[PDB]
Amino acid sequence: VDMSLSPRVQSLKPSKTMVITDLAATLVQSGVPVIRLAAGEPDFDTPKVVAEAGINAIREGFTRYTLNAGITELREAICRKLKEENGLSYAPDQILVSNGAKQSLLQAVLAVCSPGDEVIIPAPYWVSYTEQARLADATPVVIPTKISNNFLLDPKDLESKLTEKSRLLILCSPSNPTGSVYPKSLLEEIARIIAKHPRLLVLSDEIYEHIIYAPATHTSFASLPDMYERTLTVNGFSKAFAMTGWRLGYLAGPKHIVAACSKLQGQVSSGASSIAQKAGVAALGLGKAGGETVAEMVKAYRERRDFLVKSLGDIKGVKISEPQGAFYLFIDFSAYYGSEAEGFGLINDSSSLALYFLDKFQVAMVPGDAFGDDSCIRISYATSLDVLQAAVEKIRKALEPLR
Amino acid sequence: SLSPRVQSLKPSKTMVITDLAATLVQSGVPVIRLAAGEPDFDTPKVVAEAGINAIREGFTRYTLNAGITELREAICRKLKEENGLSYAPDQILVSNGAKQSLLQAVLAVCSPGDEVIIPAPYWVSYTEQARLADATPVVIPTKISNNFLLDPKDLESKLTEKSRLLILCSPSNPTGSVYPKSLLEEIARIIAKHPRLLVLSDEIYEHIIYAPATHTSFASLPDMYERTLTVNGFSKAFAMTGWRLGYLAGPKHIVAACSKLQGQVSSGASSIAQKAGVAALGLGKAGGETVAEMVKAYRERRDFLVKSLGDIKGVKISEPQGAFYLFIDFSAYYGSEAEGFGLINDSSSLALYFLDKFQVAMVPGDAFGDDSCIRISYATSLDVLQAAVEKIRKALEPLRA
Ligand SMILES: *Cc1c(COP(=O)(O)O)cnc(C)c1O
Ligand SMILES: *Cc1c(COP(=O)(O)O)cnc(C)c1O
Ligand code: NA
Ligand code: NA
């Protein structure tokens, strides 16, 4: 039997996180507990009012197929949110609800990118952006950023990398993995560059929108001059509302593009969960920015961020870019590369450093090479201050003998 | 402006009928709706309670991409106890419904230019999923006089070295036909001559089956295990369509590839739905009495419809033995003229006539690759069906003149 696979599924890169995940299990399966800082999800429960709506949907028998694009009441609520929070005007037929925002993103990429098109992706990047480009038979063009610039795209670098083939720029703000927030003035410079190239669209991943630390503010890319008709706005419920397991995300965009994504979704999964969609309606019903329910999570995230930064920031050889959003610190420990650790061996890149932290000191983190930047390691602070204080002590002890 | 691949996708043809139906209903005009592809029954109470408990207990975080271990294990047990198949948990991939399971299988194994063999009448998405893999759908018509089952000679005549996937849906949507084991064996003997040819076995209607008909998993046949992608799920048997939970079982190498694809498509399925799925499998072999009650209702409805519609002059019916659809040949009526409507000459016009003039909504067979028929769903109560048969009788009466 011929077991050959399609070239596209073969083009998918190997996991750079697998080894951490596997070693953590291995360590636990022995006698060794592990501090987990690798997860890309909130540690909080889904808000009570949201869970209530989900339970209610089940009891009321709202358990049948929905419209492919999503239930009307949810798409209407999304339009109100985009208007109230982001100043954007969309009609319900410009919204597509999917099983999480990852699906919204994939479908956008597959709908707009033709083979050979180039997809511009600033690094450090969310792992899936490059792979989704590949599934479109498109070419990722990665643009590295610098920690001293808070990992923000340099517009001059963008201009340098544009070609006739450039089709899509993917912008994540607030960012996974850096927690950086793009300021409006920089977005306006980027937008002026995009406006000069008719073929160039922008995929704006805004999933962390409400996980933001005042006075930092979120600017939707679609609100910039002349950018509405070339922007695919992606957002959802996983991060702001601790609804990762529910699987609910969405895309708002130009009708011609949204129709194409909707057609694709009709072959991929049909409508998102009827139950999850009712919960999403309730989440949006919490009012602007999720109201006090979300504000409490954000206050906790801020305490955690502030503690982590002050704690790790005073370790020799550590560089930090202060995040203004999300719940990740993308930390430069590269000064330690070249070190030899007893009972482990050479630490000379993000992967070996992360594996050293876990194998020898029981703290699981994600190496920066997973995000296209080997100079750093991603730490998630979606865990309690108690876990964070414990992790900080382990990290200190781990770096101590490396000098 | 848009990728050629998304461009290549055909839109539905079914939205017209279903939208007009909804409109009429919201207008104070009662429509008997027989167009749905989902059970009338609620999700079973024990299963619904499990999803509710999952929510209350905080099982609302991301699962393993492939699915929670508990569920993949339970799926392995089901495949053994119900289908006689042995799979390991790393040979199972849980997705957001079986439609996603199917799409990922197609994308994983088909290279550009490969052929996907799809017997008609087919479920609508199969041809579109093939296009998404840059593969060529090769449709093989079946005949109502063969119970809409593949003639092995027709399969043989269409096989090439490019033939990469054969899609076998049994019990079938839209025909209700069940592949007998002896026929599956003949097909397997033909497949064995072609090393490139894999089989995608869509077994979602497995438990919706009418004794003495039985379900044979394709992967159970001699030498077929290593070349079969077994797809099944929860939507149909357990009335869980809105929950979004399905799965693939197959050779580890292929399932691993599907899992990698899924990592870029959607990540893991709903944590809540997966907990409900565990409870559904916990109802016992074939869904226990819970599913048995549904099947009993379905059978009564099938028997009634087949007897009633079969009595009508110019109506041809096959021998449905599963699912909850009748794919009815009204083609003898094409060319007729209806007052206040005009010419009826294809399945689309006939469906529109049935709906506009007689308030019964059904799906034109053209949607499934066979314009000679109309699909009627009997996922509705017997009393409603009795009313629908009466309307259909009255709708066809003046067309015979
Ligand atoms: C979590 C995340 C998303 C959305 O995830 P879903 O759970 O699929 O909604 C999108 N972008 C980034 C960078 C994320 O981290
Ligand atoms: C309903 C159905 C499926 C599965 O649908 P999901 O709800 O996506 O699980 C698969 N094949 C056929 C023919 C169906 O009718
Ligand atoms: Na805002
Ligand atoms: Na069986």
mmCIF file of N, CA and C and ligand atoms in Angstrom, chain A residues 100-102 105 126 129 172 176 205 207-208 238-239 247, chain B residues 62, ligand 1:
data_model
loop_
_atom_site.group_PDB
_atom_site.id
_atom_site.type_symbol
_atom_site.label_atom_id
_atom_site.label_comp_id
_atom_site.label_asym_id
_atom_site.label_seq_id
_atom_site.Cartn_x
_atom_site.Cartn_y
_atom_site.Cartn_z
ATOM 1 N N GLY A 100 -13.092 28.480 17.054
ATOM 2 C CA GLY A 100 -11.875 29.153 17.480
ATOM 3 C C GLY A 100 -11.347 30.099 16.419
ATOM 4 N N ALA A 101 -10.511 31.037 16.843
ATOM 5 C CA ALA A 101 -9.899 31.984 15.929
ATOM 6 C C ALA A 101 -8.801 31.374 15.074
ATOM 7 N N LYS A 102 -8.188 30.277 15.521
ATOM 8 C CA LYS A 102 -7.185 29.619 14.670
ATOM 9 C C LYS A 102 -7.810 29.238 13.323
ATOM 10 N N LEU A 105 -8.357 32.310 11.136
ATOM 11 C CA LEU A 105 -7.082 32.690 10.526
ATOM 12 C C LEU A 105 -6.719 31.805 9.334
ATOM 13 N N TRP A 126 3.502 33.787 16.151
ATOM 14 C CA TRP A 126 2.718 32.641 16.564
ATOM 15 C C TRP A 126 2.968 31.540 15.542
ATOM 16 N N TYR A 129 1.098 30.826 12.015
ATOM 17 C CA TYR A 129 1.031 31.745 10.879
ATOM 18 C C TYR A 129 1.833 31.217 9.684
ATOM 19 N N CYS A 172 -0.123 40.559 14.712
ATOM 20 C CA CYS A 172 -0.717 40.122 15.971
ATOM 21 C C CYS A 172 -0.477 41.172 17.058
ATOM 22 N N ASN A 176 1.265 37.364 20.900
ATOM 23 C CA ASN A 176 1.825 36.105 21.369
ATOM 24 C C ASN A 176 2.967 35.892 20.391
ATOM 25 N N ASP A 205 -4.702 39.925 13.842
ATOM 26 C CA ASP A 205 -5.068 38.989 14.905
ATOM 27 C C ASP A 205 -5.176 39.765 16.209
ATOM 28 N N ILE A 207 -6.920 38.820 19.072
ATOM 29 C CA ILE A 207 -7.521 37.937 20.071
ATOM 30 C C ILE A 207 -7.197 38.359 21.519
ATOM 31 N N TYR A 208 -6.057 39.021 21.723
ATOM 32 C CA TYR A 208 -5.665 39.445 23.067
ATOM 33 C C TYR A 208 -6.108 40.854 23.418
ATOM 34 N N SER A 238 -11.575 33.023 23.281
ATOM 35 C CA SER A 238 -10.706 32.132 24.043
ATOM 36 C C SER A 238 -9.921 32.814 25.142
ATOM 37 N N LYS A 239 -9.354 33.965 24.827
ATOM 38 C CA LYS A 239 -8.366 34.563 25.725
ATOM 39 C C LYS A 239 -8.996 35.536 26.718
ATOM 40 N N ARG A 247 -14.239 26.668 22.025
ATOM 41 C CA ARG A 247 -13.953 26.746 20.576
ATOM 42 C C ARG A 247 -14.853 27.749 19.849
ATOM 43 N N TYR B 62 -8.335 24.024 26.809
ATOM 44 C CA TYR B 62 -7.873 23.259 25.657
ATOM 45 C C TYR B 62 -7.592 21.811 26.011
HETATM 46 C C1 LIG C 1 -5.011 31.569 21.341
HETATM 47 C C2 LIG C 1 -4.633 32.385 20.122
HETATM 48 C C3 LIG C 1 -5.546 32.605 19.076
HETATM 49 C C4 LIG C 1 -6.925 32.026 19.071
HETATM 50 O O1 LIG C 1 -7.090 30.683 19.538
HETATM 51 P P1 LIG C 1 -8.490 29.883 19.478
HETATM 52 O O2 LIG C 1 -8.446 29.183 20.787
HETATM 53 O O3 LIG C 1 -8.359 28.999 18.313
HETATM 54 O O4 LIG C 1 -9.589 30.895 19.413
HETATM 55 C C5 LIG C 1 -5.193 33.347 17.962
HETATM 56 N N1 LIG C 1 -3.950 33.922 17.888
HETATM 57 C C6 LIG C 1 -3.037 33.717 18.902
HETATM 58 C C7 LIG C 1 -1.695 34.360 18.779
HETATM 59 C C8 LIG C 1 -3.363 32.973 20.024
HETATM 60 O O5 LIG C 1 -2.515 32.822 20.907
#
